[PDB]
Amino acid sequence: YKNKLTVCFDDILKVGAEMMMQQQGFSQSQQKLLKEKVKLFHGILDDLETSLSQSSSYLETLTAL
Amino acid sequence: MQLVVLTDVVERLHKNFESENFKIIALQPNEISFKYLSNNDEDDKDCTIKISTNDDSIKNLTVQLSPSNPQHIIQPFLDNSKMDYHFIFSYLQFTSSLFKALKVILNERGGKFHESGSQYSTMVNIGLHNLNEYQIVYYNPQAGTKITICIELKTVLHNGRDKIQFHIHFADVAHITTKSPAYPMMHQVRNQVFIRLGNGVACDPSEIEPILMEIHNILK
Amino acid sequence: FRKEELLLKDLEIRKLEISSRFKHRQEIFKDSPMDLFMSTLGDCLGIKDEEMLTSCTIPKAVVDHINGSGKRKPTKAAQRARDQDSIDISIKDNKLVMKSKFNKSNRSYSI
Amino acid sequence: MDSIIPAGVKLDDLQVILAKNENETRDKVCKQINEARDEILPLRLQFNEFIQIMANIDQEGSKQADRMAKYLHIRDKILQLNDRFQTLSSHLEALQPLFSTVPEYLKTAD
Amino acid sequence: HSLIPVAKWFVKFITYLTQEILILINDPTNKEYTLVHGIFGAKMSRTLILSILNEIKKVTQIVAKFPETSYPILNESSTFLKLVLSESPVDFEKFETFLVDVNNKFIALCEQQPSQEREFSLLVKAEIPPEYAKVGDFLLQYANNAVISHANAAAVYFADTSGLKISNSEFFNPEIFHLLQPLEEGLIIDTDKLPIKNRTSKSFSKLLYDDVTCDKLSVSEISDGKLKRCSRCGSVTRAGNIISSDKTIVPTSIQTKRWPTMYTRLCICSGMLFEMDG
């Protein structure tokens, strides 16, 4: 998960790199690539939050037991 | 001035909240305690609106939602976004049935000990991206599988007019092959459901709560 | 009708200059996506390279070799290479310099 | 920073250590997980704000110095983004020894 | 370059009929969406679109065979023509076979039973007679597997095809889009009885989109008073006049007589065009 968060913010600039390259209209492929990148970033953030919550709950239950 | 702005807010709500469950429980100079859902408790305020009045109007109308109310998960997004209060009321009235349906879904799992050893491996929790969509994912750590159901607000052209309908569908990642161990239930849902265009299901909010239970009937 | 001819010639020169610009930029600052983003975005705005700020420091070996005024003489093959390229490139005090060779006016790159 | 949990120690030894000391490390890890949970949401909020700023780049711009100010602001924004990424990396590596017992417990229980 | 705004409405049109295919399958009993039957039933329209697709292939083949080489900067219009066809949400080749198969099936049915009213029904009535109720079911079933299988089902349903200016309700302003006087008083109305804000030709219609080149109308073209209105269908067009420099390939003061000069006096519906009063 440590590498995923780094690459995702590196890739959102990488995905845009070709977007401003043509800028340097918009292609639908690049737009949908950006959309899926941002939605997967949100999804992995949610997954990491759920994993943290589950690990925490395991922490209290093992400490109690 | 406080009373005049409160009366204006009440009139606007009556114009925008024409429903049989709309009622005001407690009236306070600094907060509003009114009920618009089907909660049975008399003194439980479904929605709390704090009154911050200025020399001419209310500075900000912060929407607060009770923990018992299933709508409390959208509280931070309402707090951090300065959207129109009328638009917030419209969204609340448009999504109240969805909130009730998801309340039933979460209370199904949240029931106390029923003297049954049916320790289901699937847990239901709400995923949130923004105010435009609400996502439900089913966590199964025992089977290591995921069941994602995304509900977005997508506009569709209807008779020369654009309307917003709930887009309940499986995500594009859910290109699940026949080889998945958990694939049977997704395939059953697809066969028995997939306005259906094969992937998406756009529905009228007045009819989302029965059809979602029809989806949830397979789930339960 | 020399006006349209010179406009189209300037446009072709501009597009080839931009081509050389990004092909050189993608390799000089490959290690810093932030620097590449901000540099290309500022040049889309039309900011001179002498005003914008850099977060990272480039090595001095490329600076010494690109000019050759140091102890090591520039290669004659390198001289031919920099002659055939359309852009005069050099770095002064951790910052490169970019100047148009045909139009000396303030060529606005804004969109 | 401080390595409360030594590296390479077994799960049972960690249980014995945790059973004593009146749970100062339990308090510390509870505070750490609480601040991680309270940090998760603001990152999403500010990331959505950055997306909104990027999408609305063609509005409220009329002077060149306005572009200077706005793009300096956004470069600063991603500056604290990388700083926050480093801080959360430090937070997770601080809890890395604590999480290291979970794979061993799962594989032993398998 | 000037053909590009027209092509946008050309693609925007074929998507509307494809969108109605998905809607009609779920509810075949909806009478309010019977227009989709007549459009495919028209016999020359299927050939007409095929001819349009034929010349489109010929133009692209000729442009590929004979590209512009002297000035690379001028290749943008030629390149954009190739891009807009490839980037269309639905492939033209798949849609080309769609109408071709309909023609063959609708010809063998004529030999099965001789009838001449069906030719009128598919062209004007836009309906299928009850005696041919079995024929209507064929359109619903076959259209799903033919072309939609090669396109994005989710995208076309939510695609923004609004503003096609097909219905009359979106031509005239909603203030006047109703009967104003009883039938006893007659059908012709004197101007003095119109509402004060609705007593000019400027407030009669939606002055947002163009009708000949299918291009968006800017504020400059609205306010210059050089646009024309059709007295028959209510259409508004700035045809027959020199276009502004911002609409050209490169901003310049050179005046070029563009194809809109064909409709200087006659509208698209054979109506007369007149200078719109300011």
Swiss-Prot record, chain A:
Leader peptide range in chain numbering: none
Cell compartment(s), UniProt: Nucleus
Function statement: Component of the Mediator complex, a coactivator involved in the regulated transcription of nearly all RNA polymerase II-dependent genes. Mediator functions as a bridge to convey information from gene-specific regulatory proteins to the basal RNA polymerase II transcription machinery. The Mediator complex, having a compact conformation in its free form, is recruited to promoters by direct interactions with regulatory proteins and serves for the assembly of a functional preinitiation complex with RNA polymerase II and the general transcription factors.
Organism: Saccharomyces cerevisiae (strain ATCC 204508 / S288c) (Baker's yeast)
Additional comment: Present with 10785 molecules/cell in log phase SD medium.
Family that this chain belongs to: Belongs to the mediator complex subunit 2 family.
Name assigned to this protein: Mediator of RNA polymerase II transcription subunit 2
Curated annotation (Swiss-Prot), chain C:
Highest taxon in the source lineage: Eukaryota
Disruption phenotype: Sensitive to amino acid starvation. Normal GCN4 protein level during amino acid starvation.
Signal peptide positions on this chain: none
Disulfide bridge positions per record: none
Subunit structure: Component of the Mediator complex, which is composed of at least 21 subunits that form three structurally distinct submodules. The Mediator head module contains MED6, MED8, MED11, SRB4/MED17, SRB5/MED18, ROX3/MED19, SRB2/MED20 and SRB6/MED22, the middle module contains MED1, MED4, NUT1/MED5, MED7, CSE2/MED9, NUT2/MED10, SRB7/MED21 and SOH1/MED31, and the tail module contains MED2, PGD1/MED3, RGR1/MED14, GAL11/MED15 and SIN4/MED16. The head and the middle modules interact directly with RNA polymerase II, whereas the elongated tail module interacts with gene-specific regulatory proteins.
Family the UniProt entry places it in: Belongs to the Mediator complex subunit 15 family.
UniProt protein name: Mediator of RNA polymerase II transcription subunit 15
Swiss-Prot record, chain D:
Residue numbers of N-acetylmethionine PTMs: 1
Localization per Swiss-Prot or TrEMBL: Nucleus
Disulfide bonds: none
Superkingdom as given in the UniProt entry: Eukaryota
Function: Component of the Mediator complex, a coactivator involved in the regulated transcription of nearly all RNA polymerase II-dependent genes. Mediator functions as a bridge to convey information from gene-specific regulatory proteins to the basal RNA polymerase II transcription machinery. The Mediator complex, having a compact conformation in its free form, is recruited to promoters by direct interactions with regulatory proteins and serves for the assembly of a functional preinitiation complex with RNA polymerase II and the general transcription factors.
Assigned protein family: Belongs to the mediator complex subunit 3 family.
More details: Present with 556 molecules/cell in log phase SD medium.
Protein known as: Mediator of RNA polymerase II transcription subunit 3
Naturally occurring in which organism (per UniProt): Saccharomyces cerevisiae (strain ATCC 204508 / S288c)
Lineage of the organism: Eukaryota, Fungi, Dikarya, Ascomycota, Saccharomycotina
Curated annotation (Swiss-Prot), chain E:
Location of this chain's protein in the cell: Nucleus
Motif Nuclear localization signal mapped to chain: 193-197
Domain of life assignment: Eukaryota
Post-translational modification: Phosphorylated by KIN28.
The protein's assembly and partners: Component of the Mediator complex, which is composed of at least 21 subunits that form three structurally distinct submodules. The Mediator head module contains MED6, MED8, MED11, SRB4/MED17, SRB5/MED18, ROX3/MED19, SRB2/MED20 and SRB6/MED22, the middle module contains MED1, MED4, NUT1/MED5, MED7, CSE2/MED9, NUT2/MED10, SRB7/MED21 and SOH1/MED31, and the tail module contains MED2, PGD1/MED3, RGR1/MED14, GAL11/MED15 and SIN4/MED16. The head and the middle modules interact directly with RNA polymerase II, whereas the elongated tail module interacts with gene-specific regulatory proteins.
Role according to the record: Component of the Mediator complex, a coactivator involved in the regulated transcription of nearly all RNA polymerase II-dependent genes. Mediator functions as a bridge to convey information from gene-specific regulatory proteins to the basal RNA polymerase II transcription machinery. The Mediator complex, having a compact conformation in its free form, is recruited to promoters by direct interactions with regulatory proteins and serves for the assembly of a functional preinitiation complex with RNA polymerase II and the general transcription factors.
Family: Belongs to the Mediator complex subunit 16 family.
Name of the gene: SIN4
